[PDB]
Amino acid sequence: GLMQFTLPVRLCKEIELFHFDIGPFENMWPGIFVYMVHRSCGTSCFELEKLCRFIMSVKKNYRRVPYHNWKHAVTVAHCMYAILQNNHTLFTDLERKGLLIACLCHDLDHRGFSNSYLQKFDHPLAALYSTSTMEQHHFSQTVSILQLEGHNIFSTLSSSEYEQVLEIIRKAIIATDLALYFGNRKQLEEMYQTGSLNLNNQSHRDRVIGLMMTACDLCSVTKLWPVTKLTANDIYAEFWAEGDEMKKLGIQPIPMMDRDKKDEVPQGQLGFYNAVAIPCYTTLTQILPPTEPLLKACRDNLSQWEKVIRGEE
Template sequence: ICNMMNAPADEYFTFQKGPVDETGWVIKNVLSLPIVNKKEDIVGVATFYNRKDGKPFDEHDEYITETLTQFLGWSLLNTDTYDKMNKLENRKDIAQEMLMNQTKATPEEIKSILKFQEKLNVDVIDDCEEKQLVAILKEDLPDPRSAELYEFRFSDFPITEHGLIQCGIRLFFEINVVEKFKVPVEVLTRWMYTVRKGYRAVTYHNWRHGFNVGQTMFTLLMTGRLKKYYTDLEAFAMLAAAFCHDIDHRGTNNLYQMKSTSPLARLHGSSILERHHLEYSKTLLQDESLNIFQNLNKRQFETVIHLFEVAIIATDLALYFKKRTMFQKIVDACEQMQTEEEAIKYVTVDPTKKEIIMAMMMTACDLSAITKPWEVQSQVALMVANEFWEQGDLERTVLQQQPIPMMDRNKRDELPKLQVGFIDFVCTFVYKEFSRFHKEITPMLSGLQNNRVEWKSLADEYDAKMKVIEEEAKKQEEGAEKAAEDSGGADDKKSKTCLML
């Protein structure tokens, strides 16, 4: 702080002795302070001349001006930070545009499903009427019954990834939301294809898994008759969210994101991957050419976004365990009711109950591979295991940590035992309660129980094999010990105190 109480008499102020200007204004006293940034660099100087009362600046003035210069420093910092934030925002927009350019369905990809050029002999899709596009699209979509889209036992194995896109579009027609909410079929096709491209080519959490979760959501709503608790708009949002629930999955779980301090982990504090899937899904809807909800009013669209948040975040199994008791209470209450109408009213009047059921539906969909016929489940389980083992390899090599048994490919023989444990401690509850809630969902519980028998048989077979190996090893060890005793027996009979010659 520089405080000149009598500036003209100060030896450092010789450059200004007389009046400053023609008005005769003279500098009598000066208070000057530096303005510094967060790095303590001087970025400016604040100087004050001549107190109004004619007295020199005192300690109180110094305190006030020091506080002021701190504020000025922060103001400059905020301006700098604002500029940096603007640049970061611009960079993000550019990166997002680049990403969208790579993942968004191209016109040629849309034509592979919506064959307007071939069937209507029209070069530009804008020249087609919406009714014409709907008609030609529905002609090429698979029959839902022959594709078993209404069945809990549905398998994606016989269907190509391109065919699954068509199946996905078919499901939106089956729940009657395309016409009701005026969804342009070009936009629906582009969105569905773009969602497929948004899934990475990882071992398990890929587009096939994303589609299976969407198909199971559809089956729970329609075949499982859970649709009666939800409006058409809610069903529309739930189905779309189910398709998107694992979009851009990296093949590693939340714990790995935290251990590796990935950018996702630094961005999201909890439910790391789930929040990323949600943000990715919302980003797609910000593009009008991908927004399948574009003809909703503001309130309806806000409802959809809220349901996306509830549904996608619910796929974090850590949250599933917290909500199980609440779901069980709903099932208990409905079981006591005399009529279906009474149960519907009990659920629908309370948005929280609907969201709890929806969250459990997402878990049931996400884990549904465990309920499929054994020939499907056994193959899918190996895909899941392989993805886990790949993460275990990363933990061992990149993080230099020993993976847990589930992630350790050196313990792959323990897979049947791990599957039995997974069924017992994670899966059984949700399918048992849904079967109690709606008997139409019982096939999922039956499939789960059948698969448990298969996995338990393999686990018992492995345990029996290990028991034989352990017993054989024990026999060999005992034999070696006995042989050692026998070979040392003669020496034991000799005197320890004298030697006979």
């Protein structure tokens, strides 16, 4: 009960900032996550023995792929931690519990390929789950790990609270399907502008948690430029491997995924910032004003990519 996690002074301070980088020491990531759960939720939310076993089973079920890996999981959970900490009173006890776990689990057993590649491959998962293929798999994997003996971190909840938290986690993980983000953001835009957005409306909360999940999932674009730039290498390492696998199926991949067309990357980043990232953090900042640093950091990185195109780097 009286066993607090403490981080070194630089991490203790920097971890509260949206643009915090979790660092290259894998062995510190579990402790960073537990630290964030204790401050975000309470030292009582989870049985420490159970939580540690859950975290290590989650780590084991992330693969050694360039980007959709254990580091991404903890990076996305940290962004959620920063949003929750800057929006203290807006979220329930169950929501703070659910969302950090949802974020840690959101890409469980990712193979580094898009839903599109699975469907064109005719992967078994594409037969089992026609839409949000990988996201339905990630949630499936989460429930599987929760059901391991000694791994049920929610055991102290009532039947009804247990069903509420697994329903929060399911929707949160489904929302990380970027295909669903466009419609979700549009509806949130309409609702915020016409003034109908109502955080006591469960369907409205769901939408807002969805947008937070997109924002945390894309938070690579909200880091300082050196982190953003080096993470984009890992992202494109996966895209190019998928492009190679598309070519093996006798399909010319979109230029984004074609390693012959690396020149077109900087312009592809502009499109992504303008079509996805900027609108995402804009709508998020409208609904949750204290998340503005994510929009500001994102705009700064767009400017850095414009400088790459103008050959100034």
